[PDB]
């Protein structure tokens, strides 16, 4: 069935989505979960939005990521205008035309993170670790808590994700490659990868590892 959360709206705007929900017997929750089917985003005239946690978890889940205009237009035309026509196309960081959520909604038999062990390491801001972890799981990766907990062998491909910012140490994130044998990278590798829903390649995101 239909269950929604909204992102980047004002109370008045939210009151409109609620009005929408009421009419169409659609559920409306504060927090995105397994069940959540729609993510309603604030966008500019052309369906570009800002990047928010729900934005990512939305794409990651292959949910409908639709512009707020889906709501107000349906209201205005006293009916529900199928989501296909209002889907969000891009964002203020990853380009106005990348068709992110689209590829996602479509590529659910091939998660950009098939055969990956990812370990979100150290502190993050504005995004709790377990949420980043949930994200990459939805993308098919498998989470690993400790650097030393990486599966050994060849089967899989390990990766260490850090967000340099939230650090206060000077022997911290430069020395990860000493405690394990995995590529290191910034969170950006994940978000940008999730935005485009195209498995970006570590090249541009690697961090300097002291041997």
């Amino acid at each position: 069935r239909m269950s929604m959360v909204v992102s980047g709206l004002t109370p008045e705007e939210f009151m409109l989505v609620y009005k929408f929900a009421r009419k169409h017997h659609i559920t409306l929750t504060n927090l995105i979960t397994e069940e959540t089917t729609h993510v309603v985003m604030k966008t500019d005239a052309e369906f570009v939005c800002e990047r928010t946690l729900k934005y990512f978890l939305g794409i990651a889940g292959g949910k409908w990521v639709v512009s707020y205009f889906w709501v107000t237009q349906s209201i205005k035309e006293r009916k529900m205008l199928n989501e296909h026509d209002f889907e969000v196309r891009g964002d203020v960081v990853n380009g106005r035309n990348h068709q992110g959520p689209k590829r996602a909604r479509e590529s659910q038999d091939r998660k950009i993170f098939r055969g990956l062990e990812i370990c979100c390491y150290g502190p993050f801001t504005n995004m709790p670790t377990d949420q980043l972890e949930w994200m990459v799981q939805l993308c098919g990766a498998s989470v690993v808590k400790e650097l030393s907990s990486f599966t050994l062998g060849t089967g899989v491909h390990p990766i260490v994700v850090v967000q340099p910012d939230a650090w206060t140490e000077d022997n911290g994130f430069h020395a990860i490659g000493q405690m394990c044998e995995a590529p290191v990278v910034t969170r950006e590798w994940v978000l940008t990868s999730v935005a485009l829903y195209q498995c970006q390649e570590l090249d541009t995101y690697l961090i300097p590892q002291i041997p």
Binding site: R51, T52, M127, L191
Partner: peptide
Amino acid sequence: SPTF
């Protein structure tokens, strides 16, 4: 919400 926080943005990224």
